[PDB]
Design an enzyme around this catalytic site. Structure first.
Site, mmCIF file in Angstrom:
data_model
loop_
_atom_site.group_PDB
_atom_site.id
_atom_site.type_symbol
_atom_site.label_atom_id
_atom_site.label_comp_id
_atom_site.label_asym_id
_atom_site.label_seq_id
_atom_site.Cartn_x
_atom_site.Cartn_y
_atom_site.Cartn_z
ATOM 1 N N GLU A 35 0.819 -1.205 0.000
ATOM 2 C CA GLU A 35 0.000 0.000 0.000
ATOM 3 C C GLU A 35 0.852 1.254 0.000
ATOM 4 O OE1 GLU A 35 -3.015 0.375 -0.423
ATOM 5 O OE2 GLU A 35 -4.019 -1.540 -0.025
ATOM 6 N N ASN A 46 -7.728 9.084 -5.160
ATOM 7 C CA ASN A 46 -8.558 8.097 -5.845
ATOM 8 C C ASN A 46 -9.420 8.778 -6.900
ATOM 9 O OD1 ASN A 46 -9.047 6.905 -2.535
ATOM 10 N ND2 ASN A 46 -7.674 5.982 -4.058
ATOM 11 N N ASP A 48 -12.560 8.707 -7.356
ATOM 12 C CA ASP A 48 -13.808 9.252 -6.837
ATOM 13 C C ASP A 48 -13.624 10.551 -6.069
ATOM 14 O OD1 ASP A 48 -12.786 8.422 -4.351
ATOM 15 O OD2 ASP A 48 -14.330 6.917 -3.975
ATOM 16 N N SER A 50 -11.718 10.966 -3.342
ATOM 17 C CA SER A 50 -11.171 10.689 -2.030
ATOM 18 C C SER A 50 -9.655 10.494 -2.140
ATOM 19 C CB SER A 50 -11.852 9.458 -1.435
ATOM 20 O OG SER A 50 -11.504 8.281 -2.151
ATOM 21 N N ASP A 52 -6.235 8.319 -0.134
ATOM 22 C CA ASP A 52 -5.743 7.294 0.793
ATOM 23 C C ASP A 52 -4.494 7.818 1.500
ATOM 24 O OD1 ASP A 52 -7.701 5.575 -0.132
ATOM 25 O OD2 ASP A 52 -6.324 4.323 -1.287
ATOM 26 N N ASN A 59 -8.757 5.409 3.553
ATOM 27 C CA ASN A 59 -9.461 6.252 2.600
ATOM 28 C C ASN A 59 -10.351 7.289 3.282
ATOM 29 O OD1 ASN A 59 -12.205 6.457 0.846
ATOM 30 N ND2 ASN A 59 -10.400 6.320 -0.470
#
Ligand SMILES: O=C(O)c1cc(O)ccc1O
Ligand SMILES: O=C(O)c1cc(O)ccc1O
Length: 129
Positions: A35, A46, A48, A50, A52, A59
């Site tokens: 990650e 991201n 959308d 958002s 991380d 998120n």
């Protein structure tokens, strides 16, 4: 902070992740490797809208507040910046909530696609724990 592999394994163990919800320590180390590359400061936007954050790429749509994610729920009740600290406490406590929500570690795409079904114990081999 960029942790070493065994350094992070030890930190995760001290904070109670070894066998948490049945996931052995190597699962958590493997997830952090893929990650964030063990970097607490990692951030990634991201599609959308958002973002991380941190070693486990938690998120902002569901788990933390970053002030720019419409509809965010802030279920861990923390600013997303808390997930970037050299102290992994906030990331671990939030991860414990995430992994307990019914889907286990499948919540982490890198865990599903790069750790699940592999020899995750390799990630802790050679480490003083
Ligand atoms: O347990 C911790 O928070 C910890 C933090 C570090 O920076 C290095 C090793 C650790 O075990
Ligand atoms: O980048 C990778 O895919 C990678 C995989 C490993 O097993 C060990 C270190 C790595 O950097």
């Amino acid at each position: 902070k960029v942790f070493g592999r065994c350094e992070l394994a030890a930190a995760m163990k001290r904070h109670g992740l070894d066998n948490y919800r049945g996931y052995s320590l190597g699962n958590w180390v493997c997830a952090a490797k893929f990650e964030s590359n063990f970097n607490t400061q990692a951030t990634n936007r991201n599609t959308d809208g958002s973002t991380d954050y941190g070693i486990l790429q938690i998120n902002s749509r569901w788990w933390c507040n970053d002030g720019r994610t419409p509809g965010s729920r802030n279920l861990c009740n923390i600013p997303c910046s808390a997930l970037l600290s050299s102290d992994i406490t906030a990331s671990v406590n939030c991860a414990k909530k995430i992994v307990s929500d019914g889907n286990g570690m499948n919540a982490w795409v890198a865990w599903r696609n790069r750790c699940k079904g592999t020899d995750v114990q390799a990630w802790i081999r050679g480490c003083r724990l």
